Structure 1
């Protein structure tokens, strides 16, 4: 099933995913596509960061849901 990932500035990256697979599986597509490594990738649904080793069903992320892609540098 597909979701939507939005970058900082506001490019939308349409992205396909499997709901009982993990956030790591989401990140490996983003990492193929754009090329940000998964430590530097930070995916925000709403105002929670999604944990790595959990599924999309855990968070309750579904078809045609918007995730926001911002980065991880050093400070925060």
Structure 2
């Protein structure tokens, strides 16, 4: 089940995360904190698809957004 996804920071740096589809958005924000030191309350995560630009919210899973292996999330400071 384990898979790699990427987060693009505002700098343009690509973070690599190890996740599972069942991981919560809060847990993803925690993993981003572990690596970048950005507190989760300041993180805005966007999943840019060809038909939607969805903001990932606490209480959902990566699976809720159909995040795929090697997907990229955009991180915005806000």
Unaligned runs of 5+ in 2: none
SS at match of 1:24: helix
Query: 1:23 deviation in Å?
Result: 0.5
Stretches of 4+ aligned residues off by more than 4 angstroms: none
Structure with bigger strand share is 2
TM-score (norm 1): 0.85
SS at match of 1:47: strand
What is the alpha-carbon distance in structure 1 between the residues aligned to residue 5 and residue 22 of structure 2?
14
Query: 1:19 deviation in Å?
Result: 0.9
Unaligned runs of 5+ in 1: 71-76
CA displacement, residues 22-61 of structure 1 (integer Å, 9 cap, x when unaligned)? 0111111111111111110111106211011101111100
Residues 4 and 12, structure 1, Cα contact 8 Å, conserved in 2: yes
